[PDB]
Design a protein around this nucleic acid. Structure first.
Ligand SMILES: [Mg+2]
Ligand SMILES: [Mg+2]
Ligand SMILES: [Mg+2]
Ligand SMILES: [Mg+2]
Ligand SMILES: [Mg+2]
Ligand SMILES: [Mg+2]
Ligand SMILES: [Mg+2]
Ligand SMILES: [Mg+2]
Ligand SMILES: [Mg+2]
Ligand SMILES: [Mg+2]
Ligand SMILES: [Mg+2]
Ligand SMILES: [Mg+2]
Ligand SMILES: [Mg+2]
Ligand SMILES: [Mg+2]
Ligand SMILES: [Mg+2]
Ligand SMILES: [Zn+2]
Ligand SMILES: [Zn+2]
Lengths: 24, 102, 83, 129, 150, 107, 149, 91, 98
RNA sequence: UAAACGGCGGGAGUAACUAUGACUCUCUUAAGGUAGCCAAAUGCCUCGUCAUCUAAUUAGUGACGCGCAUGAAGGAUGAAC
RNA sequence: GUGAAAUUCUUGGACCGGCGCAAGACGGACCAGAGCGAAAGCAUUUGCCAAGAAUGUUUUCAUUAAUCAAGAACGAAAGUCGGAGGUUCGAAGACGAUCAGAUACCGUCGUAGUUCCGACCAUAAACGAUGCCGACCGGCGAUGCGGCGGCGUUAUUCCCAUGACCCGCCGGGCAGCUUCCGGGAAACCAAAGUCUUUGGGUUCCGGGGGGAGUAUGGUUGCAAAGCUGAAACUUAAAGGAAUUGACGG
């Protein structure tokens, strides 16, 4: 991938991870 | 590799140069980077100068000129062939092409 | 020129060089005797004076401060002090 | 700012020697510089040098004889004992047949051979060969 | 280079090698001292006193002609300013910038210059407290500094 | 404003002129020189309109004598060559007196 | 009580008999006690003066505008509000103004108004935060507050 | 010592009304209860009496001002504009 | 230049000349006839300003209307309090021309 | 013009074990339910399936989601009460 | 309007031409390998307010300095919050085309935004992919500012001053050309030189490629996110500069 889009994908994944952890 | 010493633009002691829009595609180009052509063309064609002179109500009427400054991004400049790619040694000169007066 | 004589530079380049970059520092300024017309006394004025020098016997200005050198008022005479 | 007057002077001499100039001008003078140049002149690596005396720190004009290779400096003036002078000597000198190390000692500024001759250590100043 | 600017200017004064008094100077040491006293009573700082003396009365160096510096002469007579000249001018500049800034809140350039000026003030005050020119408890307060200058 | 109540907006332009023996490519005026030239050519467009009627304003901007005297006056700051009153526009008109219109046309 | 705009008690002299006339002007912001205000055609442009709109310039703004030439002030009375004098025409004696709602209104040039903005500032900026504060707000106005859907 | 980290004057509201609403009302309450320098007597005794009314304790001068601040930026720009239009109107 | 010049001249009147700060003392000095210059802040009450101007007209002394206020005039005097009216007995520094 | 009332789809085939279906075909709508959330006070089937809690749980919690018939001026959260 | 179209607007006068009005943006050409600023950045006129480099100085103080963990100010654009304003452009969204498909490139419309005020955020290929201070080491022609000296031309005036040119010198800048100074893997660099002939002072920072700027902890933020920041495991190369060939819608 383009590095910028890998960065965007990682940011989306990190928001999802934060939401999952906050739910606990 | 660094292709050009000036990085393809005239910005030397500046931080920021305001952008302009390419006359062909309306791309935002830094003003010092864009290719500028100042065209000064007869407002009538050289084929029609005689017809306009004959149809003129005046005798010594000087035909008006048309003064247009055109800005190009390098993409449109290369596609329109105003500029061309050059050899590694030939890139270094800045002398404009001759006007070919004769 | 690999063999320039740094010890003994001629006065031409000694003068063209910057005041600090000379072999020995020498100011480019001097002191001048100034004569105001219609007055008898002589005023000692710095060549690069930053203030308006005035005569005490006449309400007249002798020099006007500029960027580099005090511009003497017209009609005033001046000579150097000991070169 | 300039913090090592001797280092600046030695670098200037080295650059002028490399460029092949006949005379070099070193602007900030000092007693340490004069003693270093006197050591070099007594060993013959430089010619006569003349001190232009202004009321500030003077300047020095040195006549270069063209037989100097390097006149570097050791900027942190390390304490040099006679037990490690040999290690300094074979670290800094091109060979054991020539080359000198100038170190400031209690007896004065002088080369390592005289320092060993009169049996004293001191602080490292520089080297030349 | 400059302390707080990226400038490397060289404009200075080249004092001549001849420390002797010129023969055409008829002013004596006491005469120059009296002129300095009159100018100091008029309120001129030592820099201005030197400028006036050099421009008008033809004296090249007060130290060369009298043997003492202008601030030394003023302090000996007992009329030297309470604050040093340069510190006073730095505080004056800081007060002016703060007065401009309290009306122009968007002048971030002025805020940056104010930070530079106050840093210079604190460094100079540290130097003067080290030299015991200033009291050991002397502190520059932005609120109360306005009454010290102008 | 003219004497008869016509308000005019005048736009004047000038261009710095290079000398015949000039070798330097550019002929740029400094900012203070430009400001002085602008002030001069504003104050010698005011006084040629304030103290006279629209008729003798028009007849003297017909040959653009205003621009000619502007160019003459500005030579002591920086030479100018192409000095004209580039534009003038009417802003307000005074009530349209038919007698004034008829004396403008006839006698 | 009931309005956010402060009121200004202003005392005039009766021109026809020996008496003092007390008015209850709406306070334009910036006026203070002990200040002289001037009301009439020849009054100058200052905050608190009352003068006809036709005598005012093309960009001035006004506080207590008359809807009709001769009644008292009717427009831009609520706190922080103002009207703007846009345009005039000396013939037909009409003045176009902009109201606080943004609408454009043509009124007579003889309508008077107070120069400036009415005091009371941005009263609606502060959140009420409390049903009790709303209760106290509307108790001074009328029986409208607790609103059932 | 410092008693609150960030709430300051709106610590009286406790946990109620929402953090953003408390933050919004904080600066308004600070300006409401602040004492301003009187421009008539020079003392810092000009404080709000009611909404839009600002009274000075010393010179007993009452001024019509803003709801929460002594003067509003709107009114300041208005005063400057009226001064400019007056000086343009007269000559 | 006028404001900074008058501020510097006031600073030099302080510490080098005799002055007096305040309304009551200013009036007392004026009616003693030894006040040579009276400085009034623009913050001054209009009645007080008019009365001091009348006193100065009677005493043939000058009045300068400082372009500050009482706070800024106190700062110019170098004090940490507001001064609204002040008088100079003798300048000592050519603020008052002989 | 939806912070108006309101509404927000089907049928087939398809990946080198199976199983799903990223993908592809069509029919159709005014648009085909998005972000979220869930056997929820909203899920018939149903005491759903898995885990946890118990010796044993049609209860509770966590998770899953083709959800009979969840869903955005109301959705989802979040202290204090 | 486009490659061609179509969505769209149009006998209700669309487009076009003329005269006006209103609004909000934007300051073309002049405009440059020109200037200023710590960077970000800065271009209509005029006024006000403070600030500043360079220059000139035979002024003053006399080492007051350089770089700097922690800390602090500013910090494009996008984004967030509150209030105004909203002309144009235009994320999202809708539609028309293109296509095998076309959630796009092209076209029409259009929300947030783009504008101003106040408060956050602290990130950019925030670049010279190049720390700051100091010294030395080639030539040349220009350019900007300041100063100095000179044949002359020009502006008025009666002459010098003072401007505009011309010829030089000095200092501080933006740079450029050239060179077997020298360096470098080379491209190239008068600095990226004065480095095995290795030491002027000082700050930050890298240690094969991935995992990974990820997990977790802490901290900042309204949020988006920012700062600090692993390991398991995996891999024999990944990369840089140049050469030849092949290929290029
Ligand atoms: Mg490439
Ligand atoms: Mg940039
Ligand atoms: Mg209700
Ligand atoms: Mg809709
Ligand atoms: Mg769903
Ligand atoms: Mg469910
Ligand atoms: Mg249930
Ligand atoms: Mg139970
Ligand atoms: Mg459950
Ligand atoms: Mg799930
Ligand atoms: Mg921004
Ligand atoms: Mg907003
Ligand atoms: Mg559009
Ligand atoms: Mg260092
Ligand atoms: Mg690694
Ligand atoms: Zn283009
Ligand atoms: Zn008061």
């Amino acid at each position: 991938m383009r590095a910028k889009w890998r960065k965007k994908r990682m940011r989306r994944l990190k928001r999802k991870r934060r939401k999952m952890r906050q739910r606990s | 590799t660094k292709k050009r010493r000036n990085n393809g633009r005239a910005k030397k002691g500046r931080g920021h140069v305001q952008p302009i829009r390419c006359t062909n595609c309306a791309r935002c180009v830094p003003k010092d980077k864009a290719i500028k052509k100042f065209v000064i063309r007869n407002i009538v064609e050289a084929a029609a100068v005689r017809d306009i002179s004959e149809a003129s109500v005046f005798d010594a009427y000087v035909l008006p000129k048309l003064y247009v400054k055109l800005h190009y991004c390098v993409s449109c400049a290369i596609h329109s062939k105003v500029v061309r790619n050059r050899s590694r040694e030939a890139r270094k000169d800045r002398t404009p092409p001759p006007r070919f007066r004769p | 020129p690999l063999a320039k004589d740094l010890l003994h530079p001629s006065p031409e380049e000694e003068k063209r060089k910057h005041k600090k970059k000379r072999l020995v520092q020498s100011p480019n300024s001097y002191f001048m005797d100034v004569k105001c017309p219609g007055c008898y006394k002589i005023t000692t004025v710095f060549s690069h004076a930053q203030t308006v020098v005035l005569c005490v016997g006449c309400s007249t200005v002798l020099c006007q401060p500029t960027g580099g050198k005090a511009r003497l008022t017209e009609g005033c005479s001046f000579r150097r002090k000991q070169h | 700012v300039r913090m090592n007057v001797l280092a600046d002077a030695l670098k200037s001499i080295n650059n002028a020697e490399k460029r092949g100039k006949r005379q070099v001008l070193i602007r900030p003078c000092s007693k340490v510089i004069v003693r270093f140049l006197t050591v070099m002149m007594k060993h013959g690596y430089i010619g006569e040098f003349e001190i232009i005396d202004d009321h500030r720190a003077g300047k020095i004009v040195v006549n270069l004889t063209g037989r100097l290779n390097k006149c570097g400096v050791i900027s942190p003036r390390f304490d040099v004992q006679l037990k490690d002078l040999e290690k300094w000597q074979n670290n800094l000198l091109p060979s054991r047949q020539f080359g000198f190390i100038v170190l400031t000692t209690s007896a004065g500024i002088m080369d390592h051979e005289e320092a060993r001759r009169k049996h004293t250590g001191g602080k490292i100043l520089g080297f030349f060969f | 280079g400059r302390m707080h600017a990226p400038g490397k200017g060289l404009s200075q004064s080249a004092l001549p090698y001849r420390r002797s008094v010129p023969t055409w100077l008829k002013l004596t040491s006491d005469d120059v001292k009296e002129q300095i006293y009159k100018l100091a009573k008029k309120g001129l700082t030592p820099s201005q006193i030197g400028v006036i003396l050099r421009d008008s009365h033809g004296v090249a160096q007060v130290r060369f002609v009298t043997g003492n510096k202008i601030l030394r002469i003023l302090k000996s007579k007992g009329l030297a300013p309470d604050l040093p000249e340069d510190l006073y001018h730095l505080i004056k500049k800081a007060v002016a910038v703060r007065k401009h800034l309290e009306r122009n809140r968007k002048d971030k350039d002025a805020k940056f210059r104010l930070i530079l000026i106050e840093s210079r003030i604190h460094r100079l005050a540290r130097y003067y407290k080290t030299k015991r020119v200033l009291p050991p408890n002397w502190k520059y307060e932005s609120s109360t500094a306005s009454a010290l200058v102008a | 404003k003219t004497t008869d109540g016509y308000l005019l907006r005048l736009f004047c332009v000038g261009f710095t002129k290079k000398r015949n023996n000039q070798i330097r490519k550019t002929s740029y005026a400094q900012h203070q020189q430009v400001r002085q030239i602008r002030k001069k050519m504003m104050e010698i467009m005011t006084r040629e309109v304030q103290t006279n009627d629209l008729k003798e304003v028009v007849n003297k901007l017909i040959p653009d004598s205003i621009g000619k005297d502007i160019e003459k006056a500005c030579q002591s700051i920086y030479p100018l060559h192409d000095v004209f009153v580039r534009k003038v526009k009417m802003l307000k008109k005074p009530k349209f007196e038919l007698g004034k219109l008829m004396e403008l046309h006839g006698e | 009580p009931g309005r956010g705009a402060p009121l200004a008690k202003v005392v005039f002299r009766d021109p026809y008999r020996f008496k003092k006339r007390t008015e209850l002007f709406i306070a334009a912001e910036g006026i203070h006690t002990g200040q002289f205000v001037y009301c009439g055609k020849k009054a100058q442009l200052n905050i608190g003066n009352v003068l006809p709109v036709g005598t005012m310039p093309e960009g001035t703004i006004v506080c207590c505008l008359e809807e009709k030439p001769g009644d008292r002030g009717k427009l831009a009375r609520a706190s922080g509000n103002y009207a703007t004098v846009i345009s005039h025409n000396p013939e037909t004696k009409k003045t176009r103004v902009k109201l606080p709602s943004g609408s454009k209104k043509v009124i007579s040039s003889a309508n008077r108004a107070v120069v400036g903005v009415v005091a009371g500032g941005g009263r609606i900026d502060k959140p009420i935060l409390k049903a009790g504060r709303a209760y106290h707000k509307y108790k001074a106005k009328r029986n409208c507050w607790p609103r059932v859907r | 010592a410092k008693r609150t980290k960030k709430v300051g004057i709106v610590g009286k509201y406790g946990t109620r009304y929402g953090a953003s609403l408390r933050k919004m009302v904080k600066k308004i309450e600070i300006s409401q209860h602040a004492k301003y320098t009187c421009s008539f007597c020079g003392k810092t005794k000009m404080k709000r009496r009611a909404v839009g009314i600002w009274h000075c304790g010393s010179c007993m001068k009452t001024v019509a001002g803003g709801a929460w601040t002594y003067n509003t930026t709107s009114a300041v720009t208005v005063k400057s504009a009226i001064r400019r239009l007056k000086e343009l109107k007269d000559q | 230049k006028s404001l900074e010049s008058i501020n510097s001249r006031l600073q030099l009147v302080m510490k080098s000349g005799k002055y007096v700060l305040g309304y009551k003392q200013t009036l007392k000095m004026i009616r003693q006839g030894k006040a040579k210059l009276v400085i009034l802040a623009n913050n001054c009450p209009a009645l007080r300003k008019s009365e001091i101007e009348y006193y100065a007209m009677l005493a043939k002394t000058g009045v300068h209307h400082y372009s500050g206020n009482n706070i800024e005039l106190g700062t110019a005097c170098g004090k940490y309090y507001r001064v609204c009216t002040l008088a100079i007995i003798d300048p000592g520094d050519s603020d008052i021309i002989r």
